[PDB]
Design an enzyme around this catalytic site. Structure first.
Site, PDB file in Angstrom:
ATOM      1  N   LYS A 103     -13.689  -0.806   5.265  1.00  0.00           N
ATOM      2  CA  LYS A 103     -14.236  -1.531   4.035  1.00  0.00           C
ATOM      3  C   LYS A 103     -15.415  -2.610   4.417  1.00  0.00           C
ATOM      4  O   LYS A 103     -16.356  -2.738   3.468  1.00  0.00           O
ATOM      5  CB  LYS A 103     -12.975  -2.078   3.204  1.00  0.00           C
ATOM      6  CG  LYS A 103     -12.173  -0.953   2.618  1.00  0.00           C
ATOM      7  CD  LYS A 103     -10.750  -0.967   3.038  1.00  0.00           C
ATOM      8  CE  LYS A 103      -9.811   0.189   2.261  1.00  0.00           C
ATOM      9  NZ  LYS A 103      -8.405   0.025   2.763  1.00  0.00           N
TER      10      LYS A 103
ATOM     11  N   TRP B 269       0.941  -0.968  -0.091  1.00  0.00           N
ATOM     12  CA  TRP B 269      -0.072   0.096   0.003  1.00  0.00           C
ATOM     13  C   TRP B 269       0.905   1.190  -0.165  1.00  0.00           C
ATOM     14  O   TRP B 269       1.796   1.255   0.788  1.00  0.00           O
ATOM     15  CB  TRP B 269      -0.779   0.065   1.154  1.00  0.00           C
ATOM     16  CG  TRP B 269      -1.920   1.010   1.582  1.00  0.00           C
ATOM     17  CD1 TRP B 269      -2.518   1.606   0.460  1.00  0.00           C
ATOM     18  CD2 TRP B 269      -2.082   1.961   2.469  1.00  0.00           C
ATOM     19  NE1 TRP B 269      -3.443   2.435   1.032  1.00  0.00           N
ATOM     20  CE2 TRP B 269      -3.237   2.631   2.228  1.00  0.00           C
ATOM     21  CE3 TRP B 269      -1.545   1.952   3.831  1.00  0.00           C
ATOM     22  CZ2 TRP B 269      -3.619   3.568   3.106  1.00  0.00           C
ATOM     23  CZ3 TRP B 269      -2.117   2.822   4.897  1.00  0.00           C
ATOM     24  CH2 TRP B 269      -3.104   3.689   4.317  1.00  0.00           C
TER      25      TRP B 269
ATOM     26  N   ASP C 118      -1.564  -5.654   9.066  1.00  0.00           N
ATOM     27  CA  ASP C 118      -2.145  -4.491   8.606  1.00  0.00           C
ATOM     28  C   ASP C 118      -3.324  -5.216   7.917  1.00  0.00           C
ATOM     29  O   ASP C 118      -3.149  -6.306   7.045  1.00  0.00           O
ATOM     30  CB  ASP C 118      -1.495  -3.589   7.528  1.00  0.00           C
ATOM     31  CG  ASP C 118      -2.532  -2.500   6.821  1.00  0.00           C
ATOM     32  OD1 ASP C 118      -3.775  -2.453   7.239  1.00  0.00           O
ATOM     33  OD2 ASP C 118      -1.978  -1.621   6.198  1.00  0.00           O
TER      34      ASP C 118
HETATM   35  C1  LIG Z   1      -7.544   0.684   3.290  1.00  0.00           C
HETATM   36  C2  LIG Z   1      -6.335   0.309   3.936  1.00  0.00           C
HETATM   37  C3  LIG Z   1      -5.804   0.820   5.146  1.00  0.00           C
HETATM   38  C4  LIG Z   1      -6.509   1.873   6.291  1.00  0.00           C
HETATM   39  O1  LIG Z   1      -7.410   2.391   5.361  1.00  0.00           O
HETATM   40  P1  LIG Z   1      -8.001   3.417   6.719  1.00  0.00           P
HETATM   41  O2  LIG Z   1      -9.446   3.760   5.656  1.00  0.00           O
HETATM   42  O3  LIG Z   1      -7.232   4.592   7.342  1.00  0.00           O
HETATM   43  O4  LIG Z   1      -9.242   2.492   7.571  1.00  0.00           O
HETATM   44  C5  LIG Z   1      -4.585   0.175   5.586  1.00  0.00           C
HETATM   45  N1  LIG Z   1      -3.949  -0.828   5.037  1.00  0.00           N
HETATM   46  C6  LIG Z   1      -4.587  -1.208   3.878  1.00  0.00           C
HETATM   47  C7  LIG Z   1      -3.550  -2.627   3.139  1.00  0.00           C
HETATM   48  C8  LIG Z   1      -5.591  -0.700   3.324  1.00  0.00           C
HETATM   49  O5  LIG Z   1      -6.216  -1.401   2.044  1.00  0.00           O
END
Ligand SMILES: *Cc1c(COP(=O)(O)O)cnc(C)c1O
Ligand SMILES: *Cc1c(COP(=O)(O)O)cnc(C)c1O
Lengths: 396, 396
Positions: free
Chosen positions: A246, A130, A211
């Protein structure tokens, strides 16, 4: 004082949205940011969520500050989702959870805590990862090192390279692992591979940081937590930054959690007091609304049953779009075999498009994808599938 | 990795609440944290707020992520409240506002931005100040220096000492000023004193940073912004970290703003791109609920009229409690003249109680106040006024 401040380069994910919302073109398609869209191309508030909000509107009597770590029930429900209902971690009081502003906030809190309270100076992240990972860790003053992961030629997890790359990580280094639905590849280790990684990190002295942003999007809630649980069974310490953005469609309410695990109750509590201090010096205490919605749904049998079905529908729709994407590409004259896409989990398909093709899709066809070639399959519908596949075959 | 982590000392404000909620004693009184209580000793959700929430429940169609800087209308409404409706700052597009998780989040964002994009290394804070100021700035790696402020003997703003203390601040240093209702003293500069400070900082090259947390609690919305506006008229650059936690009773929703002002439109935009980068590496984007409530109320004439009256009622009730506090103390045999309390603005009364008296009030009488002697006048009611005043005269 601000005269020489140079402008920041736009965020590769978030800046894409500014562009798309400025494109005057009629048939633009947004396959950028990782947000779910239903068959009509909308991102509705979940029904279970609307119901919990009604409940809160009727039942809340105060907006008095929550404690630094947030809603207790939220933390308890989070630990069960992560580790399991009868987990030894839960029974031995080895884990403490702080409610945070999204998964990003959880990663930042973990970074600050690590930087200021431990001997950690290096965090290992997969290649690719990410885009915002490096950015969060560098903010806390930690350096980011990369470990091999994706085999772009075979569209596969290059496990030996992963292992050989990590042999450069020292005892005391943090190794960031994605929970499941690897962002951006969609390629995840098998359960055996996870077990191998778990014994290897315990042997090498690495501190695992997970994560966990897509629980429920690969196979199911409990299944998606397998790799993490394989790790929790053998590690005395670990940190999990999870997100409900999500799986609850609560993106803008900022709902996440940072779970700290230590060898015992007394150590975790001492360590958690410092995490709380890091939170107080950042945003003070967390936002109540979204976490409250999550606690309400998870605590209520009826609301939970509805939410779980809604998540199941999101998961299944993405699976149907994946199949549809590879068939239509095949029908539209795409000469490459994009069948590998069927093998990826979650919202994202790492297409293999080059930087220039991605750029051309945008400038000439109004199809927005991340520069890395990452495309949001959840942004696809049967209505935009054809023009989208037509655009892609044209840039190949 | 966490074996040697030492526990953090409890937060002087926030830790007080843990104590109070553990005190089995029946008649305990909480005069600690800066939260408003009505005549019944409750902290209700404002009616204007309940109305806006109903509206959001009926009208929201998505929880899709907000941009890094939040709800645009929120930012616009914030600038008008701060600078005035027809402000040149607004008309010249010199200010950019990021919606943040509370006023604390705004201070942290300002600190990170300053640390990473400017030559700033030192921030000046008043003595005394909100306990969490040092903590936020030290987190970003800036050092905190103190400037004289309160004359404990005359319970007065020691202006000459303030001036003489700041002569040690260099060009390029940040000087933190409280907007109005100084936390913890309640002593604020007169409008003339503010004008003097404004010309002095422009002459010495200081960058002003305002912590504006109580707009509406001293005299009124527009009046309370006077010192800040005196400053905005002469500075090319400034930063305002404002909070809606107290004036909207939205404590747990985390609603604040960080407003950046530069010499012109192009400079502020360049500078703001870096602030946005600092936000993305922290919590990504802000929580929608509370800010949405604030934008809804401020944008609607009817809701705004109701909110303004509710704020007026909070302000007036605190004023009545102040009078009541000093009379009852006088009646209960308190031999000191506590009349100075009538002269303080906002929720807090800096009592002059020593650390040990504050400690004794708690251990022996269940009356909770901050160790500095700061007492929350808004936590007082006609019902708890007598036992509270009895406890105080007993420790003198
Ligand atoms: C979406 C995501 C996050 C964090 O998103 P937040 O909208 O801050 O909750 C962290 N890591 C990954 C791999 C993600 O896809
Ligand atoms: C309350 C307060 C803040 C911020 O509080 P938040 O609840 O984070 O909005 C900042 N400064 C002062 C002086 C305050 O009183």
């Amino acid at each position: 004082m601000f005269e020489n401040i140079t402008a920041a380069p736009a965020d590769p994910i978030l800046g894409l949205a500014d562009l798309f919302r400025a494109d005057e073109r009629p048939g633009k398609i947004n396959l950028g940011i990782g947000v779910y869209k239903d068959e009509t191309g909308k991102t509705p508030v979940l029904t279970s969520v609307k119901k919990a909000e009604q409940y809160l509107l009727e039942n809340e009597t105060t907006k008095n500050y929550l404690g630094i770590d947030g809603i207790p029930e939220f933390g308890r429900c989070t630990q069960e989702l992560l580790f399991g209902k009868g987990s030894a971690l839960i029974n031995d009081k080895r884990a403490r959870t702080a409610q945070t502003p999204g998964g990003t906030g959880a990663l930042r809190v973990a970074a600050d805590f690590l930087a200021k309270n431990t001997s950690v100076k290096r965090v290992w992240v997969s290649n690719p990862s990410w885009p915002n990972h490096k950015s969060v860790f560098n903010s806390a003053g930690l350096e980011v090192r990369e470990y091999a992961y994706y085999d772009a030629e075979n569209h596969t997890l290059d496990f030996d390279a992963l292992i050989n790359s990590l042999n450069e990580a020292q005892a005391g280094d943090v190794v960031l692992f994605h929970g499941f639905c690897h962002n951006p590849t969609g390629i995840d280790p098998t359960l055996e591979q996870w077990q191998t990684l778990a014994q290897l990190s315990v042997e090498k002295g690495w501190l695992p940081l997970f994560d966990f942003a897509y629980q429920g999007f690969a196979r199911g809630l409990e299944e998606d937590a397998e790799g993490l649980r394989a790790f929790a069974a053998m590690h005395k310490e670990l940190i999990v930054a999870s997100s409900y953005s999500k799986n609850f469609g609560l993106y803008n309410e900022r709902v996440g959690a940072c779970t700290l695990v230590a060898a015992d109750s007394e150590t975790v509590d001492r360590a958690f007091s410092q995490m709380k201090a890091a939170i107080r010096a950042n945003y003070s205490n967390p936002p109540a609304h979204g976490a409250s919605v999550v606690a309400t749904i998870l605590s209520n049998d009826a609301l939970r049953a509805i939410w779980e079905q809604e998540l199941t529908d999101m998961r299944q729709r993405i699976q149907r779009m994946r199949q549809l994407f590879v068939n239509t590409l095949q029908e539209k004259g795409a000469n490459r075999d994009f069948s590998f896409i069927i093998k990826q989990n979650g919202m994202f398909s790492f297409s293999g498009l080059t930087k220039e093709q991605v750029l051309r899709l945008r400038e000439e066809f109004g199809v927005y994808a991340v520069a890395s070639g990452r495309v949001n399959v959840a942004g696809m519908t049967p209505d935009n599938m054809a023009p989208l596949c037509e655009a892609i075959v044209a840039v190949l």
